[PDB]
Amino acid sequence: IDLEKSQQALVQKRHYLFDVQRNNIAMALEVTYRERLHRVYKEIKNRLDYHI
Amino acid sequence: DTSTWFITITSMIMTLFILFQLKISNYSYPASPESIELKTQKHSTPWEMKWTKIYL
């Protein structure tokens, strides 16, 4: 009994953490694209603030 | 009485020690039965360790 569940324990463990590695890198590209759209507004706000 | 001459019994004693080494050789020791329970425990524990290594 204890070695039958030892089969099934590693097949629910592995598919959870192999999609966490999908989504831990998925957030790494959104927060570097959201900060790409935001920064290009910041360095054109400096010229909208300087000449006044 | 003080009997004599001895050519008798002593050749009929070593035929007897083919009998007594036949009967008493087929006996059973209670202790040997406690030894076979020990090796069955360590084998499945290593087999579970072979299953734990099949996990790890």
From Swiss-Prot, chain B:
Subcellular localization(s) per the UniProt record: Mitochondrion membrane
Keyword terms: Acetylation, ATP synthesis, CF(0), Hydrogen ion transport, Ion transport, Membrane, Mitochondrion, Transmembrane, Transmembrane helix, Transport
Keyword set includes Transmembrane: yes
Positions carrying N6-succinyllysine: K50
GO BP terms in the entry: proton motive force-driven ATP synthesis
Gene Ontology cellular component annotations, sorted alphabetically: mitochondrial membrane; proton-transporting ATP synthase complex
Source species, domain of life: Eukaryota
Modified residues (N6-acetyllysine): K50, K53
Major site of localization recorded for this protein: mitochondrion
A single MF term (Gene Ontology): proton transmembrane transporter activity
Its membrane topology: Single-pass membrane protein
Stretches that traverse the bilayer: 4-20
UniProt similarity note: Belongs to the ATPase protein 8 family.
Subunit organization: Component of the ATP synthase complex composed at least of ATP5F1A/subunit alpha, ATP5F1B/subunit beta, ATP5MC1/subunit c (homooctomer), MT-ATP6/subunit a, MT-ATP8/subunit 8, ATP5ME/subunit e, ATP5MF/subunit f, ATP5MG/subunit g, ATP5MK/subunit k, ATP5MJ/subunit j, ATP5F1C/subunit gamma, ATP5F1D/subunit delta, ATP5F1E/subunit epsilon, ATP5PF/subunit F6, ATP5PB/subunit b, ATP5PD/subunit d, ATP5PO/subunit OSCP.
Role of this protein: Subunit 8, of the mitochondrial membrane ATP synthase complex (F(1)F(0) ATP synthase or Complex V) that produces ATP from ADP in the presence of a proton gradient across the membrane which is generated by electron transport complexes of the respiratory chain. ATP synthase complex consist of a soluble F(1) head domain - the catalytic core - and a membrane F(1) domain - the membrane proton channel. These two domains are linked by a central stalk rotating inside the F(1) region and a stationary peripheral stalk.
Protein name in the entry: ATP synthase F(0) complex subunit 8
Organism, as annotated: Sus scrofa (Pig)
Gene: MT-ATP8
Residues of the full protein shown: 5 to 60 of 67
